[PDB]
Amino acid sequence: SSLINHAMSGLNAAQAALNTVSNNINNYNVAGYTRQTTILAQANSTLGAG
Amino acid sequence: MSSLINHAMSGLNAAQAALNTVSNNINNYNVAGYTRQTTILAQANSTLGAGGWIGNGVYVSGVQREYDAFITNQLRGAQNQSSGLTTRYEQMSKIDNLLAD
Amino acid sequence: MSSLINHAMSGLNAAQAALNTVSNNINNYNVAGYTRQTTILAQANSTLGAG
Amino acid sequence: GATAATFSLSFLNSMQQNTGANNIVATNQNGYKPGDLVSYQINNDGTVVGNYSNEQEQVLGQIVLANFANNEGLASQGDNVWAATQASGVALLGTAGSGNF
Amino acid sequence: SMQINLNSTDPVPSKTPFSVSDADSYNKKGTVTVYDSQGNAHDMNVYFVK
Amino acid sequence: LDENRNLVNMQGMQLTGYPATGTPPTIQQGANPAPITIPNTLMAAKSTTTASMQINLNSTDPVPSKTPFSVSDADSYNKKGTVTVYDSQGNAHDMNVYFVKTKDNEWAVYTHDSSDPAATAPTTASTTLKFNENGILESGGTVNITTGTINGATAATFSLSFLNSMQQNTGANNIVATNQNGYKPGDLVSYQINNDGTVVGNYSNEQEQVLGQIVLANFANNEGLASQGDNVWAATQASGVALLGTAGSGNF
Amino acid sequence: YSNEQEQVLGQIVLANFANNEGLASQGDNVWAATQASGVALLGTAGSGNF
Amino acid sequence: TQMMYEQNMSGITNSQAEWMKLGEQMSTGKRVTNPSDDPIAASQAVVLS
Amino acid sequence: RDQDKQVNIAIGSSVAQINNYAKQIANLNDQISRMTGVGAGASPNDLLDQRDQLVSELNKIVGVEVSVQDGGTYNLTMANGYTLVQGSTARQLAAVPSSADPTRTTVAYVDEAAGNIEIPEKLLNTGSLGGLLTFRSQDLDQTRNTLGQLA
Amino acid sequence: DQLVSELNKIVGVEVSVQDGGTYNLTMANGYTLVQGSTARQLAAVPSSAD
Amino acid sequence: PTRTTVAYVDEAAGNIEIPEKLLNTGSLGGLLTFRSQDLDQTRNTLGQLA
Amino acid sequence: KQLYKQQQSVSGVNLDEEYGNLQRYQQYYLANAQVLQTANALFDALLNI
Amino acid sequence: KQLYKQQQSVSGVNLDEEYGNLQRYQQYYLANAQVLQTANALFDALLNI
Amino acid sequence: KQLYKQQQSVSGVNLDEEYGNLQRYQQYYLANAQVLQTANALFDALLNI
């Protein structure tokens, strides 16, 4: 449930970040390629839980 | 009595809530913007009543946002100072490189 | 008591901090102005149980 | 537009050297500006001490502890907090130096 | 209160008397800050000579 | 809450309590308890009628070049304070405060109703303020503006004070406080019940209205109370009759 | 738009009720209007009580 | 945890930047280049030029 | 002069940047206000964190004191004592080439009383954009005119 | 401490630990440099002497 | 008065310089002895030569 | 950076510390589970008569 | 040449921070895996009863 | 030069004792972590009861 949802969504973010770093470090030498960084953010935390 | 079942189950609720706090703590540790969130919960201590020390009063209080607001705003001021000094020194470097040439 | 885990976490934290300190002795090394920084260790405070 | 301060300025502990070298090093002064800052610390016994926008220190604060004649007698039924009982004796107040704290 | 320590064997300077920026007619500058009736701030500057 | 938004038990038996009435809504003991409800309504048009701000200042500023201040005199006044207000229809006005000074333990103030294009900025200092060498404000604590009527709304009127400031021994002109009593109206999305028995709602003006408190019964002999089914007691001669008090009323 | 341009058209209507728990579900992930629930109160997202 | 990563990583960065400068001077063969290499004597260099 | 126009363009963009941050801060302020109104003492600490961190982000561009409303939200004060925000509302800031000395770009800010300013750049001591401004004023202009004087 | 060491290496100076916007920082003529906000700004001048 | 030496401050009466003959110990006693014999005697010898 | 270090020392999270917190709560949960198990056992035992 | 140095000093990809990020997110991923497995384990420990 | 070196003697990082220390404390950190696992086995056995 929500705890597993936390576990996984963070896994999604980690995978995305790894993809980004691999992308950049591989593309590193190409003329015209600018470094790129991937950013994180919190969910639509909204309340009905007390 | 069988409320023990309930009682224990309130222990389960406390554990689940503590777990979710732990989960958000761990999952967001690297997010640009986050603060430690310690879980809080009560005890069936010596508040007066008419039952004695029965399992009356253990439950989840909520979660705090552990951030030094005082040094946080002071930090924003320090960021203003750094902004100014860093900005103008970079603009300096721009000319400096040509006199380097 | 939660002592069993707490001993370990105390020592773990202390070791990590001392690690940071000795690093700080390494990371600067060459730069003039620095002086070597040394660390202190001691027992935890007396929640002494019953003595 | 404020009062022109008047004061006594004392050259305490000056000395003359048959064979020495010269310097002026000391100052005592007993005035300070209006304070306007949030800055304080708590230390070791429930007393509270702070540094201030006068760039220096002050001490102001203490937290009072309580103990009873017989510890285990308290009210014993709820909520992380206690209440006194006749069996336990009414509170004796103190701060932590006198054995019972 | 401010303290001064000196050596006795000095060739007293030839300024009769001292002047606020005549450098030979003072030796070390000591300073005393002060605050008036209910806490407005001031600082006082001093000169000393033999 | 039923489709009437009246508070009821599962059978529909009403939850009674003491109501809040008037403005500000206050729990009136001078009534008898009745069913409490939640009207789906907006907040009262709480106009601004008072204000206060605190001004801890240095009184050595030399005469600014472009005195007097009226409109754009950015070389005439030394510090800005502001307090936003609401006319007596409940709409939005803002007040702006401007500080001008050549009186060496004192300060003088300009003001304007800075949402009002019909009124225009007064070209003269609206009030003068005083301090003593003991680092303390002494007097000057009054000024009023009537937030000018524009769109057929009644203009509101307020009075403003500046009490108990401390003096900044040199240079550091400062101002820290904000007070004004009023707020615009706003719709309701909140309802909370608390430990004291009270019931509060909160409104899109970002402020509150209270209407509700729950009152409890107490008896000389509980053994007289008789269940009528549906977990409801009939207060009986055998128990005495109800003595009423809310939580925190000593024995409740 | 396939011609480097944008248009906006769309907004859905939301419902809020006097007696949420009273809401008459039909099963199959749906509810319906009734007296006991109170008549429907409409709105747009984020607005007021929505 | 951030502080530790930043500490050691920036240690690497400043160690590199130091080496970079030594590398600059060594490779070029000039001890002085610019206001950042000589805010003072370069003026006398102009004079002597 | 290329560098001159660079600083002009940069400040022009910075205007939009501050306006965007103001809008975002106002939006989140609305959110926390309404959500704590519903909350009954709720702790949407994540919302709190992003709101105040976004504020800290804006501060760098122009030194700020994020002045508080009673419980919920703020009104935004620049370091000089000027202030432009109300609850969930953020007013506009605009980019203008100067009418005072027309070889520069500058910003415009408005008080809803009657009109907008072409900002008196005397005010602009705040960190980033005032960092650019001090460069332009003392450093850039002095060397510029020294060069021209010698030529 | 390193900054004051270099400041010394360009012009002789005293160095002893204290504060008050000031430091034990006398220099070549008994005059004192650093105090509060008034850290003295010296000048390059044509010489009345020559 | 050329020298510094160690004392116990019996604050009911004042500072009493414990005679230096007594400080035989390692670190502090050794430093005191080092001045007493080595440095003062060596400067005396240097001056006698001169 | 010093101010950042201290603010983060309050605010940040160490992976080590939470793993320790994680393990405790496993103990807490299983302890409560044991409690409910024994309660179930006694419940049915009582009902046996 | 100089302005190119500016452009690439701001925009270019490195090897250092990418390396550090690779490890930091490797660690983050493994930690979230710890969460996954231990959480399901606690759920199953409950589910058995 | 002599007196600068005399200052360095006390102040200067020596790079050998520190390196040996770096190893020594890694061992300590491992000792701590492993000990935690042992307590885990202890309350594992207690739980399994």
CB F29 within 8 A of CB F23: no
Chain A residue with the nearest C-alpha to that of B30: A40
Name the burial class of residue N35, with classes exposed (0-12), middle (13-18) and buried (19+) by CB atoms within 10 angstroms of its CB.
middle
User: Which chain B residue lies closest to I55 (C-alpha atoms)?
Assistant: B76
What is the helix (H) or strand (E) element at residue I94, kind and residue range?
strand I94-97
User: Between chains, do D32 and E39 touch, taking CB under 8 Å as contact?
Assistant: yes
| Token output for F145 | 């503006």
The distance in angstroms from the start CA to the end CA of chain D is: 52
Residues B23, B25, B28, B32: what is their CA dihedral angle, to the nearest 10 degrees? 170
Residue E42: its H or E element:
strand E41-46
How was this structure determined? It was done by cryo-EM
Q: Which of F104, F134, F137, F166 to mutate to test the interface with E (most CBs of E within 10 A)?
A: F134
Contacts of A among chains (3+ CB pairs under 8 A): B, I, M
Q: Which 3 state secondary structure label does DSSP give G43?
A: strand
- One DSSP character per residue, H2-28 reads HHHHHHHHHHHHHHHHHHHHHHHHHHH
Give residue for tokens 């405790």: L24
Please identify which residue in the block is written with the tokens 């009270």. Answer: F198
Length of chain I: 151
- Contact indicator for B64, B37 with CB cutoff of 8 Å: yes
Question: Whose structure tokens read 């754009």?
Answer: F72
Token pair, residue M20, equals 């550090």
CB atoms within 10 A of CB E36: 19
Ordered alpha helix ranges (H), chain I: 2-39, 45-61, 127-134, 141-150
Element (H, E) at M5: helix M2-11
Taking the C-alpha atoms of residue D31 and residue D40, their distance in angstroms, rounded to an integer, is 20
In what side-by-side order are the strands of the sheet with F92-100? F79-86, F92-100, F106-113, F127-132, F136-139
Q: Can you read off the two tokens belonging to residue B81?
A: 């100072």
For residue M19, the one-letter residue type is: Y
Asked if the peptide bond before residue I97 counts as cis, ω within 30 degrees of 0, the response is no
**C35's tokens:** 């002086």
DSSP state of A13: H
Tokens describing residue B56: 């009356």
Contacts of residue G36, defined as CB under 8 A and 6 or more positions apart, other chains included, come to F2, F3, G19, G22, G24
What distance in Å separates the CA atoms of residue A9 and residue M36, rounded to the nearest whole number?
11
CA distance F164 to F55: 9
* Residues of chain A with a CB closer than 8 angstroms to some CB in chain I: 41-42, 45-47
CA-based angle L13:L14:L16, to the nearest 5?
145
> Residue B51 corresponds to which tokens in the numbers above?
């039952």
Yes or no: say if A40 and A13 are a contact pair by the CB < 8 Å rule: yes
Are F111 and F96 a contacting pair, CB within 8 Å? yes
What is the chain H residue with the closest CA to B33? H2
As a whole number of angstroms, the distance between CA F206 and CA F209 comes to: 11
Which residue from B minimizes the CA distance to I125? B84
- Distance of alpha carbon I111 from alpha carbon I91, whole angstroms: 9
Chain M residues with CB under 8 Å of L19 CB are 31, 34
Query: Which of L22, L24, L25 has the highest number of chain B CBs within 10 A, making it the mutation to test binding with B?
Result: L25
Give the separation between CA B25 and CA B35, rounded to whole angstroms.
Answer: 8
Taking the C-alpha atoms of residue F248 and residue F195, their distance in angstroms, rounded to an integer, is 9
Q: In angstroms, what is the C-alpha Rg of chain C?
A: 16
Rounded to a whole number, what is the distance in angstroms from the first to the last CA of chain F?
25
Burial (0-12, 13-18, 19+ Cβ within 10 Å), F10? exposed
**How many Å apart are CA F86 and CA F51, to the nearest integer?**
12
Q: What residue type is I54 in one-letter code?
A: L
**Quick one: tokens of F159?**
């009075």
In the DSSP assignment, the letter for residue G11 is -
| Cross-strand pairs, B63 | B39
F164 touches chain D (CB under 8 A): no
Q: Which residues of M touch B26 (CB under 8 A)?
A: 31-32, 35
How many Cβ atoms from other residues are within 10 Å of residue D91's Cβ?
A: 13
Chain H interface test: which of L10, L14, L16, L18 (most H C-beta within 10 Å)? L14
Beta-carbon separation of E28 and J29 below 8 A: no
| Rounded-to-integer distance, Cα L7 and Cα B74, Å | 10
Please state, in angstroms and rounded to a whole number, the distance separating the CA atoms of residues D94 and D89.
15
Query: What is the CB neighbour count within 10 angstroms for residue D2?
Result: 23
Q: How far apart are CA I93 and CA I17, in angstroms?
A: 10
CA gap I121, M16 in Å, rounded: 41
Q: Are strands F20-21 and F16-17 parallel, antiparallel or unpaired?
A: unpaired
Closest CA to F56 of B71, E39, I70, J20: E39
CB contact under 8 Å between M16 and H5, yes or no, is no
Quick one: DSSP state of residue J27?
B
Burial annotation I3-42 (CB, 10 A radius, 16+ → b, else e): eeeebbeebbebbebbbebbbbbbebbbbbbbbbbbbeeb
Cβ of I7 under 8 Å from any chain B Cβ?
yes
Token pair of D33 as six digits = 């500006």
Q: Residue C11 carries which side chain, given as an amino acid letter?
A: G
F98 contacts F111 by C-beta, under 8 angstroms: yes
Residues in contact with F195: Cβ distance below 8 Å, sequence separation at least 6, in sequence order:
F247
Q: Using CA atoms, how far apart are residues I34 and F206, in angstroms rounded to an integer? A: 7
Among M25, L23, F10, smallest CA distance to A21 is for M25
Rounded-to-integer distance, Cα B60 and Cα B39, Å: 8
**Helical pair L2-11 and B69-100, crossing angle rounded to 10 deg:** 140
Can you tell me the distance from the alpha carbon of N1 to that of N7, in angstroms, rounded to the nearest whole number? 10
**Given the structure tokens 């009534």, which residue do they identify?**
F31
Q: How far apart are CA F212 and CA F16, in angstroms?
A: 9
Placement of tokens 């002895």 in the chain: K33
What single string gives the DSSP state of each residue in D20-88? ---EE--------PPP-----EEETTTEEEEE-TTSSEEE-----EEE-SSGGGS---BTT-----TTT
Residue tagged 């620049």 (tokens): I78
Q: Which residues contact F223 (CB under 8 A, 6 or more apart)?
A: F238, F239
The alpha carbon of residue H9 is apart from the nearest alpha carbon of chain M, in Å, by 8
Residues of M in contact with L24 (CB under 8 A): none
Residue of M nearest to B99 (CA): M2
Q: To the nearest whole angstrom, how far is the Cα of E9 from the nearest Cα of chain D?
A: 7
Do N and B touch, counting CB pairs below 8 Å (3 needed)? no
Tokens of residue H32, six digits: 């002085």
D94 beta partners: D65
Residue of I134, I114, I87, I118 lying closest to I15 (CA atoms): I118
Nearest Cα residue to B63 out of A13, I39, F199, I25: I39
Give Cβ neighbours of residue D61 (< 8 Å, ≥ 6 apart). Answer: D40, D42, D46, D47, D48, D49
d(CA C14, CA C28): 22
As a whole number of angstroms, the distance between CA H4 and CA F109 comes to: 53
H or E segment at K9?
strand K8-10
CA distance D83 to chain B (A): 6
Asked if F230 and F11 count as a contact pair (C-beta separation under 8 A), the reply is yes
Q: Could you write out the three-class secondary structure of chain F?
A: CCCCCECECCCCCECEEECEECCCCEECCCCCCEECECCCCCCCCECCCEEECCEECCCCCCCCCCCCCCCCCCCCCCEEEEEEEECCCCCEEEEEEEEECCCCCEEEEEEEECCCCCCCCCCCCCEEEEEECCCEEEECCCEEEEECCCCCCCCEEEEEECCCCECCCCCCCEECCCEECCECCCCECCCEECCCCEEEEEECCCEEEEEEECCEEECCCHHHCEECCCCCEECCCECECCEEECCCCCCC
Cα–Cα distance, F98 to F82 (Å, whole number): 8
In whole angstroms, what is the distance from residue F161 CA to residue F150 CA? 26
Is the Cα torsion angle I62, I68, I69, I71 positive or negative in sign?
positive
Residue B43 token pair: 């005890």
Give whole-number Cα distances, J27 to B17, E25, E43, F87, I125, in Å. Answer: 66, 16, 21, 66, 34
| Residue F248 sits at the chain I interface (C-beta within 8 Å) | no
For chain K, give me the number of helices (H) and strands (E)? 2, 2
Tell me whether chains G and A touch (3+ CB pairs under 8 A): no
DSSP I44: -
Look at the block and give the residue holding tokens 């038996």: F13
CA distance B66 to B37: 6
Q: Of C19, L17, C36, C21, nearest to N28 (Cα)?
A: C19
Chain A contact present for M21, CB below 8 A: yes
List of chain B residues whose C-beta atoms are within 8 Å of the C-beta of residue M2: 97-98, 101
Which of helix, strand or coil describes residue E31? Answer: strand
Contact F110, F125 (CB under 8 A): yes
Residue pair F47/F86 in contact by the 8 Å Cβ criterion: yes
Tokens encoding I75: 């009104």
CB atoms within 10 A of CB N40: 16
Q: What are residue I98's phi and psi, to 5 degrees?
A: -65, 140
- The Cα D72–Cα M41 span in angstroms is 41
- F50-52/F179-180 β-pairing: antiparallel
Give which of K34, K26, K24 is closest to K3, Cα–Cα.
K34
**I-side interface with F, Cβ within 8 Å?**
33-34, 37-38, 40, 69, 72-73, 81-83, 86-87, 111-114, 117, 120
